[PDB]
């Protein structure tokens, strides 16, 4: 085609050896082993569509957990429930523990998910946190505990733990304080997703990739300001544009201003006609500014 921009995942080698299987009763799912902690969803202690988890906790005893790292069985030394995750302290320090931190992802931010089944990593894919506080992934049965993370050369920031499917192809989970993103929770009842916005800055970046690739037919002489855009965003299914140094950097590179493309977006909302932008007839919002900039400009 081709635009130089893909869904790029951070390499996986630092994370894979942190993935474990956690088993309780007849139920297995995945956990993440860092130092002498393993984190995993608390519904492992279910045998669930409306669990009373504190009562479930009471029937938990210690050698009830089997935690395998490959063929190696870890001995759990304590369990506690924190939000919707368990933190199981083990007898053993993970020698592959990377530099890490725990953090959060705001809507529009992207990261990689390492899908794992039975402790065994399967594949990784790029995802965008939505305004609905869900992600569009690919998870079957036994995927819970799969981890979403961001790299930083050497350091890993862990941001997501997979728990829940809202509806066909619509996903959510917790951060590493054990706290669900958005308002969801770990129960198998109707949980209708928060309404979801087009991620404005990501579309903008994507427009910038397109101009750099010599596809700029939507650039016109008009301009719409951020204040003006933000009033209009609400009503029309778009998130607030905030400031952003990467968009700024692309503005300068291309000579097309952020407000030139805000106007362009407004026109594009009313239809693409039949014209395509980097081969789609819809807005692409799945790549962050810094994803476009790192693939094209090199960081």
């Amino acid at each position: 085609a081709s635009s130089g921009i893909v869904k790029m995942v951070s390499p996986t080698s630092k994370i894979e050896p942190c993935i474990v299987s956690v088993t309780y009763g007849s139920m297995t799912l995945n956990g993440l082993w860092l130092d002498d902690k393993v984190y995993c969803p608390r519904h492992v202690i279910c045998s669930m569509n409306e669990p009373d988890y504190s009562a479930l906790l009471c029937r938990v005893t210690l050698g009830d957990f089997t935690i395998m790292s490959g063929r190696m069985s870890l001995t759990v030394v304590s369990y506690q429930m924190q939000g919707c995750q368990l933190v199981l302290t083990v007898s053993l320090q993970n020698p592959y523990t990377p530099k890490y931190t725990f953090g959060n992802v705001k809507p529009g931010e992207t990261f990689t998910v390492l899908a794992a089944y039975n402790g065994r990593p399967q594949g990784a894919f790029h995802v965008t946190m939505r305004s609905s506080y869900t992600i569009k992934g690919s998870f079957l049965c036994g995927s819970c505990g799969s981890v979403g993370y961001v790299l930083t050369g050497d350091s890993v920031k862990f941001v997501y733990m997979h728990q829940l499917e809202l509806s066909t192809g619509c996903h959510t989970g917790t951060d590493f304080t054990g706290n669900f993103y958005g308002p969801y929770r770990d129960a198998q009842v109707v949980q209708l997703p928060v309404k979801d916005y087009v991620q404005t800055v990501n579309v903008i970046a994507w427009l910038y990739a397109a101009i750099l690739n010599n596809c700029a037919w939507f650039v016109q002489n008009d301009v719409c300001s951020t204040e003006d855009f933000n009033v209009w965003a609400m009503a029309n299914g778009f998130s607030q544009v905030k400031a952003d140094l990467v968009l700024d950097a692309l503005a300068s590179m291309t000579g097309v201003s952020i407000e030139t493309l805000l106007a362009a977006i407004k026109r594009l909302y009313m239809g693409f006609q039949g014209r395509q932008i980097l081969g789609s007839c819809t807005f692409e919002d799945e790549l962050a500014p810094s994803d476009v900039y790192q693939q094209l400009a090199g960081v």
Binding site: P41, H43, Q188
Partner: peptide
């Protein structure tokens, strides 16, 4: 309706 993985 929601499903726990």
């Amino acid at each position: 309706x929601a499903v726990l993985x």
